[PDB]
């Protein structure tokens, strides 16, 4: 149908033993714009993202997000034996659900399409409306942080399994990720780089 489907299963577990908010059922609405730095020779992705919690008409951690917060992202990846590393930096403004980040493949050519890594590469920067404050698990787990685990099934192709630790290092929000990808078809849409450079 002109698209490649990627089904995400996700679970998040607090790292610390302090109180967290367990939410009522809801969803995050995410828009993402991908671009390139004309002066950047390395394989890279520039990302502008806005995320807003929604779905309900109606702790100390959210205090850490009232202003602009610097972000660091580090990913270690293995897809079908292809090793690669990605570093990102930028900032988040949860008041506006806003992320601005630049990611670099530090090992050379990224062996998978950038758009397949977007979801892996900090939902604590989501904008929770005022009437929805009590459902923001992500900020409530801070600063000690949370573990984010996913499996991503690419329909008719391979899968990613990810484990990430998201927590504060001083004033900086850090996302450290390990990604393992398996059973990808060598000339499929992922390893064959058949995806458009964008994200809807």
């Amino acid at each position: 149908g002109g698209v490649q489907l990627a089904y995400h299963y996700q679970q998040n577990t607090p790292i610390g033993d302090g109180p967290v908010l367990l939410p009522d059922n809801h969803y995050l609405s995410t828009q993402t714009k991908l671009s390139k730095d004309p002066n950047e020779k390395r394989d890279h992705m520039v990302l502008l993202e806005f995320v807003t919690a929604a779905g309900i008409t109606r702790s100390k951690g959210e205090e850490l997000f009232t202003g602009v917060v610097p972000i660091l992202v580090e990913l270690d990846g293995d897809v079908n034996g292809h090793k690669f590393s990605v570093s990102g930096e930028g900032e988040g403004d949860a008041t506006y659900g806003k992320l601005t980040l630049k990611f670099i493949c530090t090992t050379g050519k990224l062996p998978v399409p950038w758009p397949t890594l977007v979801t892996t590469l900090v939902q604590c920067f989501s904008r929770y409306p005022d009437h929805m404050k009590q459902h923001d698990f992500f900020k409530s787990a801070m600063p000690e942080g949370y573990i984010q685990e996913r499996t991503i099934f690419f329909k008719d192709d391979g899968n990613y399994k990810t484990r990430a630790e998201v927590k504060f290092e001083g004033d900086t929000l850090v996302n450290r990720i390990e990604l393992k990808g398996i059973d990808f078809k060598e000339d499929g849409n992922i390893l064959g780089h058949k995806l458009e450079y964008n994200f809807n």
Binding site: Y7, Q10, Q11, T30
Partner: peptide, 30 residues
């Protein structure tokens, strides 16, 4: 615009999420 559906996971004192991402294919490869 994607939608991430979030639900509490009381057992792990955390949350569960499930969603679908749709990646566009380039043309003229098939």
């Amino acid at each position: 615009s994607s939608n991430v559906y979030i639900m509490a996971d009381k057992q792990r004192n955390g949350i569960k999420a499930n969603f679908q991402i749709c990646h566009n294919l380039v043309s003229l490869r098939d």
